[PDB]
Amino acid sequence: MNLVQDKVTIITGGTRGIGFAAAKIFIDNGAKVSIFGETQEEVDTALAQLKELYPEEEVLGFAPDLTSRDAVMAAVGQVAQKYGRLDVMINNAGITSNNVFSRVSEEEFKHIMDINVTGVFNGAWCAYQCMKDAKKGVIINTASVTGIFGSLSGVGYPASKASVIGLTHGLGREIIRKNIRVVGVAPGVVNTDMTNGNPPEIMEGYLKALPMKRMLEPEEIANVYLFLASDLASGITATTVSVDGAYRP
Amino acid sequence: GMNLVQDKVTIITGGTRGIGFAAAKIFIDNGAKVSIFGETQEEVDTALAQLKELYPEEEVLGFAPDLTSRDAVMAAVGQVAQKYGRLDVMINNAGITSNNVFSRVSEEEFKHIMDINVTGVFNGAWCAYQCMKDAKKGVIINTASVTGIFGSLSGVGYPASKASVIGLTHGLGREIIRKNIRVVGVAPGVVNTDMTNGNPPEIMEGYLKALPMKRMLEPEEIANVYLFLASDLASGITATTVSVDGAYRP
Amino acid sequence: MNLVQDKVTIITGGTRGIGFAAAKIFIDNGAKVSIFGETQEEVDTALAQLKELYPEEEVLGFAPDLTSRDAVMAAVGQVAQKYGRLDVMINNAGITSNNVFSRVSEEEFKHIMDINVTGVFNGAWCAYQCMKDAKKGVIINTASVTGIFGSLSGVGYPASKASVIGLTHGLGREIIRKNIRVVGVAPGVVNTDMTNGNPPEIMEGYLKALPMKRMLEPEEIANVYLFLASDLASGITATTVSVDGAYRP
Amino acid sequence: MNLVQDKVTIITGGTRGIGFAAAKIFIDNGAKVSIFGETQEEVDTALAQLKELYPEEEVLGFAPDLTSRDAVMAAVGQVAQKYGRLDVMINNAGITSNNVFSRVSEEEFKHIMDINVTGVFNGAWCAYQCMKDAKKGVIINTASVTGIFGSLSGVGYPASKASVIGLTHGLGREIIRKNIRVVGVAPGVVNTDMTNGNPPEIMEGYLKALPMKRMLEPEEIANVYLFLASDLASGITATTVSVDGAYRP
Numbered sequence: 001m002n003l004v005q006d007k008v009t010i011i012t013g014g015t016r017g018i019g020f021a022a023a024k025i026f027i028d029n030g031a032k033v034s035i036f037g038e039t040q041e042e043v044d045t046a047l048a049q050l051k052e053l054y055p056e057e058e059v060l061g062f063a064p065d066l067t068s069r070d071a072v073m074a075a076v077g078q079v080a081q082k083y084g085r086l087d088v089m090i091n092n093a094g095i096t097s098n099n100v101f102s103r104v105s106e107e108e109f110k111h112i113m114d115i116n117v118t119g120v121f122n123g124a125w126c127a128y129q130c131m132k133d134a135k136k137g138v139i140i141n142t143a144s145v146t147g148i149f150g151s152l153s154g155v156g157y158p159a160s161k162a163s164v165i166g167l168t169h170g171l172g173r174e175i176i177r178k179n180i181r182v183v184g185v186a187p188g189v190v191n192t193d194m195t196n197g198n199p200p201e202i203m204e205g206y207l208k209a210l211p212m213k214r215m216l217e218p219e220e221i222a223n224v225y226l227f228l229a230s231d232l233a234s235g236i237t238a239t240t241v242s243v244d245g246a247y248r249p
Numbered sequence: 250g251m252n253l254v255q256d257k258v259t260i261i262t263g264g265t266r267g268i269g270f271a272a273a274k275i276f277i278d279n280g281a282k283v284s285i286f287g288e289t290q291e292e293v294d295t296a297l298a299q300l301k302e303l304y305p306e307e308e309v310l311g312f313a314p315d316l317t318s319r320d321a322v323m324a325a326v327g328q329v330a331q332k333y334g335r336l337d338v339m340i341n342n343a344g345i346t347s348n349n350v351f352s353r354v355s356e357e358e359f360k361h362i363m364d365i366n367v368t369g370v371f372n373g374a375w376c377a378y379q380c381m382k383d384a385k386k387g388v389i390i391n392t393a394s395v396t397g398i399f400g401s402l403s404g405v406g407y408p409a410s411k412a413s414v415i416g417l418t419h420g421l422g423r424e425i426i427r428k429n430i431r432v433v434g435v436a437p438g439v440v441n442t443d444m445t446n447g448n449p450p451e452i453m454e455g456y457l458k459a460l461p462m463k464r465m466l467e468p469e470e471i472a473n474v475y476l477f478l479a480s481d482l483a484s485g486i487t488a489t490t491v492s493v494d495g496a497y498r499p
Numbered sequence: 500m501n502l503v504q505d506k507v508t509i510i511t512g513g514t515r516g517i518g519f520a521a522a523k524i525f526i527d528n529g530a531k532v533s534i535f536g537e538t539q540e541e542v543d544t545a546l547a548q549l550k551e552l553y554p555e556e557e558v559l560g561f562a563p564d565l566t567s568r569d570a571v572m573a574a575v576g577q578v579a580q581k582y583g584r585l586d587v588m589i590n591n592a593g594i595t596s597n598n599v600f601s602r603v604s605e606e607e608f609k610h611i612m613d614i615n616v617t618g619v620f621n622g623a624w625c626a627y628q629c630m631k632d633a634k635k636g637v638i639i640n641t642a643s644v645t646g647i648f649g650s651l652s653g654v655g656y657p658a659s660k661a662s663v664i665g666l667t668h669g670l671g672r673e674i675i676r677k678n679i680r681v682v683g684v685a686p687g688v689v690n691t692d693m694t695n696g697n698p699p700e701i702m703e704g705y706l707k708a709l710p711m712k713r714m715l716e717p718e719e720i721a722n723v724y725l726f727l728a729s730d731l732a733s734g735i736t737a738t739t740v741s742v743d744g745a746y747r748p
Numbered sequence: 749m750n751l752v753q754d755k756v757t758i759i760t761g762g763t764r765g766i767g768f769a770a771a772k773i774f775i776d777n778g779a780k781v782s783i784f785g786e787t788q789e790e791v792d793t794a795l796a797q798l799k800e801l802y803p804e805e806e807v808l809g810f811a812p813d814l815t816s817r818d819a820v821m822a823a824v825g826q827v828a829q830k831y832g833r834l835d836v837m838i839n840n841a842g843i844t845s846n847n848v849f850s851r852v853s854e855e856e857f858k859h860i861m862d863i864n865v866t867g868v869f870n871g872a873w874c875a876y877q878c879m880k881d882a883k884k885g886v887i888i889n890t891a892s893v894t895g896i897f898g899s900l901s902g903v904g905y906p907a908s909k910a911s912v913i914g915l916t917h918g919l920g921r922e923i924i925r926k927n928i929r930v931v932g933v934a935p936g937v938v939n940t941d942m943t944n945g946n947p948p949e950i951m952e953g954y955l956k957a958l959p960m961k962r963m964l965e966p967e968e969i970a971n972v973y974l975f976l977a978s979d980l981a982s983g984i985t986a987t988t989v990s991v992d993g994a995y996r997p
């Protein structure tokens with residue numbers, strides 16, 4: 001199976017969790033993969049892990065400030081200049097929130113809006129600049145089940161993830177004439193560092209609320225990134241695919 | 250090369266032409282054991298002969314049950330389950346459209362589109378569930394439409410029936426996920442099949458140019474989404490409908 | 500307050516629950532009200548109740564088979580003939596389902612599809628025929644929260660109520676050029692004969708788990724019918740308004 | 749008609765357009781109105797216009813930086829101090845975008861996200877702090893049709909307005925236990941300074957694409973704010989009402 005054969009791919013937040021599982025699955029399927037991480041330390045750790053798994057595969061790693069379009073452009077530009085093209089952009093880096101409304105500070109709301117929305121806008125804009133003249137490409141934006149069904153706390157999380165769905169819808173409709181597809185992915189509860197850090201009572205809570213009686217594995221989200229990036233999904237754009245196993249927050 | 254549905258016993262309703270027939274081919278290519286349903290025995294015979302030319306060593310069963318009769322659907326689903334010992338995938342793809350102005354929509358026309366597009370999907374999903382529930386495994390795929398989400402400017406029975414399919418998929422998916430059976434919808438935009446061809450090229454030239462992709466989707470582009478959704482790659486996808494419309498808005 | 504002053508109104512399922520609460524609120528706001536019921540007995544009971552409340556008000560009552568468009572046309576036609584016009588049509592009559600999928604018979608699925616969807620189509624079609632030449636009117640269709648968020652059982656209920664939302668969207672887009680508005684109302688859990696079952700010991704736990712800690716009252720749905728039928732809602736069409744107090748099935 | 753009798757109301761962006769039409773309709777319906785505007789000059793102009801219409805009515809006016817929660821709290825706090833309570837908060841201030849994706853600068857995307865989302869979050873948070881102990885109140889957030897159906901350009905506009913819908917959904921579900929309702933309003937194309945200044949070619953396109961063959965008037969949106977703020981809408985929360993006359997971008 002080589003669903004993304006010879007596709008030049010960038011995965012933001014590709015150092016751990018869903019993004020890292022996607023790096024592996026995309027390399028397994030013939031893609032040329034580059035990853036972004038928050039810090040250079042996280043990037044070095046992930047590149048060393050990928051070097052053990054794939055000793056003959058070259059994987060580029062960068063740590064741009066996702067809130068700065070110039071910093072994202074510098075990193076995206078290096079990938080496009082090394083391979084002469086950019087086929088796939090996955091705006092997967094993201095954070096969550098669970099604070100009760102009264103305890104949501106200005107700083108916390110600004111930060112989740114910055115990373116989850118401005119980070120996605122910057123990545124999609126920089127990918128588009130490298131894809132527009134080639135008149136081909138795929139931009140994948142990671143939303144959440146909370147972007148559709150809301151949440152009971154951490155208002156910045158459904159607000160930012162609903163914005164990602166809205167950005168995906170509008171951008172997809174706008175740039176389809178340049179043969180560039182824009183698709184969203186809205187996961188439910190996934191077994192990563194984002195969810196495994198919670199207290200045991202919250203973990204117990206999730207596991208009883210999940211209709212599948214298990215969290216999804218990062219591979220189950222990464223397999224959807226894989227299909228959506230492949231030419232099999234040539235009819236899918238300006239929409240968000242729910243991958244939540246019927247979980248409802 | 251690919252074998253995304255290897256050894257999966259699959260039934261495709263409306264598998265004699267358009268999207269369903271393209272799915273029959275793509276599913277056989279990917280290792281599935283395929284059975285098709287068609288509206289008439291003549292359509293079934295034609296499709297089986299076409300598939301026999303393409304795949305001379307492949308056995309494909311064909312049936313023409315009245316989709317509005319659950320006993321007729323159960324008899325056909327039962328024969329497939331009896332022959333292979335299980336049922337892994339059910340695709341409720343058979344459907345029809347409408348474009349009549351509201352004043353000209355007869356009682357008979359509204360009843361018929363509601364019967365085929367909704368009762369036909371309910372009957373197929375119910376009969377599949379009965380053959381899947383003890384195995385605690387399976388995938389049910391229901392074909393909706395872009396009109397089920399964005400409405401239409403005419404033929405009210407078409408968005409009404411296709412929105413019902415999305416609602417059925419959502420509710421059924423939430424209900425039977427505890428039996429490890431996934432229920433997923435597919436909402437196509439405008440697809441190049443017998444459903445959409447008939448108009449002269451002069452009329453169609455301006456229509457195609459106004460489409461966001463400047464072309465209709467091909468039946469293979471919908472069938473490839475059936476393939477992914479039926480595969481173990483979509484293990485996290487249930488109680489939802491995937492839009493495959495190339496940004497087309499009715 | 501006379502939000503529907505002199506508006507000739509038909510309310511299907513106006514003999515009890517939401518429909519009956521709407522009959523009272525519409526009479527209070529100056530409308531000329533006619534009600535439909537399943538049986539002649541229900542119609543006689545409701546008309547007598549409205550005579551004790553409003554002795555000087557004339558209310559017409561009919562019991563047409565909602566699955567027969569000719570029977571609905573005969574009743575709608577009599578109202579339009581008596582007042583010379585039809586201003587408001589409320590397709591409020593409906594039923595629910597809670598049977599587990601295996602136990603949903605052909606007959607049960609056919610019946611809920613017939614009453615909840617064909618009944619709404621027939622009422623909307625007959626209203627349209629009496630409104631189209633006047634180039635004014637409002638058609639209100641009662642959906643449900645299950646039409647948007649699904650359900651855990653009784654598949655015919657989300658299937659039929661999602662169809663009502665789809666019919667409302669398509670019909671609204673089609674006939675807005677004739678200055679006829681088509682709007683949906685999606686209630687959550689309302690205190691009527693439809694939810695009047697279980698003893699209080701069992702109910703106490705259920706009510707406590709509801710986001711508002713109570714069901715909605717039929718007046719709370721009828722007040723939304725009132726606004727939507729008024730000229731205040733002149734910009735609202737081809738959409739469904741959620742009146743569920745944040746309840747999620 | 750006095751749908752919002754004795755209700756202490758704050759309207760952000762109440763100096764012109766929809767917000768100003770709402771100021772008038774809310775005063776007509778018995779509310780105690782306070783307005784916010786971008787500049788002190790706009791506030792002075794609107795207060796003078798309202799003094800000519802209502803010479804005996806006192807209307808407070810403020811121009812806080814909506815991106816600063818402390819500046820919004822200072823203004824909201826003064827209203828709550830003067831009347832001892834806050835009954836209604838309308839987060840109506842907003843801006844639009846129509847730039848092609850390549851021409852959307854970092855600055856433009858940041859600004860629309862700041863005003864349309866952080867401005868709504870700040871207003872809703874400050875209102876909640878003044879409403880939570882009273883265990884009653886209504887927060888109205890202005891989204892847009894583009895938040896549901898996307899757009900063909902100005903990606904910041906559907907992204908920010910979809911975020912407003914997501915914020916409304918999540919916040920509504922979270923604070924309904926404090927008897928505070930959170931509702932959204934999604935207008936189509938409204939005849940205000942936001943749209944009326946466009947070149948004839950763009951105007952022609954709008955008028956052709958509008959199924960009603962006219963734009964909605966600001967009163968048609970303000971009448972929906974009125975109903976949603978009234979006790980008639982007691983069952984409506986954690987949802988967005990479309991007021992678009994079947995217009996689709």
Ligand SMILES: NC(=O)c1ccc[n+]([C@@H]2O[C@H](COP(=O)([O-])OP(=O)(O)OC[C@H]3O[C@@H](n4cnc5c(N)ncnc54)[C@H](O)[C@@H]3O)[C@@H](O)[C@H]2O)c1
Pocket residue numbers: 012013014015016017018019036037038039042066091092093094095096115142143144145186187188189190191192193194195
């Ligand atoms: N884990 C879940 O249950 C869940 C639920 C729904 C949505 N999602 C979304 O899935 C995506 C991936 O999440 P995950 O669970 O794999 O998370 P993770 O914590 O396992 O990894 C997140 C990745 O994003 C990067 N990232 C985070 N904050 C960053 C910042 N400030 N700057 C730059 N990069 C940053 C990290 O470096 C890391 O590589 C996110 O968009 C998340 O919101 C996850």
Ligand SMILES: NC(=O)c1ccc[n+]([C@@H]2O[C@H](COP(=O)([O-])OP(=O)(O)OC[C@H]3O[C@@H](n4cnc5c(N)ncnc54)[C@H](O)[C@@H]3O)[C@@H](O)[C@H]2O)c1
Pocket residue numbers: 262263264265266267268269286287288289292316342343344345346365392393394395436437438439440441442443444445468
């Ligand atoms: N083609 C499009 O533009 C379009 C758009 C949106 C939705 N869809 C949906 O896709 C599905 C497949 O459609 P298609 O375009 O391939 O159509 P098609 O006409 O090419 O084939 C339809 C198939 O369904 C079967 N079928 C139709 N009526 C039937 C009946 N009364 N009883 C039993 N079987 C019946 C036919 O035998 C045939 O095999 C349908 O559900 C259709 O509504 C298609």
Ligand SMILES: NC(=O)c1ccc[n+]([C@@H]2O[C@H](COP(=O)([O-])OP(=O)(O)OC[C@H]3O[C@@H](n4cnc5c(N)ncnc54)[C@H](O)[C@@H]3O)[C@@H](O)[C@H]2O)c1
Pocket residue numbers: 511512513514515516517518535536537538541565590591592593594595614641642643644685686687688689690691692693694717
């Ligand atoms: N009550 C709830 O919790 C709730 C929830 C969501 C949606 N709804 C919807 O609200 C609407 C009103 O329901 P309600 O709770 O007031 O119910 P109800 O049982 O109190 O009243 C139903 C009314 O519809 C009529 N009706 C029912 N079946 C009919 C048939 N076969 N033919 C003709 N008339 C028929 C009855 O005579 C009666 O007047 C329905 O469409 C229902 O689906 C109710």
Ligand SMILES: NC(=O)c1ccc[n+]([C@@H]2O[C@H](COP(=O)([O-])OP(=O)(O)OC[C@H]3O[C@@H](n4cnc5c(N)ncnc54)[C@H](O)[C@@H]3O)[C@@H](O)[C@H]2O)c1
Pocket residue numbers: 760761762763764765766767784785786787790814839840841842843844863890891892893934935936937938939940941942943
């Ligand atoms: N007019 C339309 O076609 C339309 C379409 C859909 C949504 N909307 C939404 O409706 C709402 C009202 O818009 P309108 O058409 O009445 O606009 P308008 O331009 O007529 O008025 C906007 C108001 O918001 C204030 N405002 C704008 N930017 C601000 C800022 N930086 N800081 C503080 N206050 C600011 C202005 O002072 C003014 O009072 C907005 O949220 C807008 O996005 C309008």
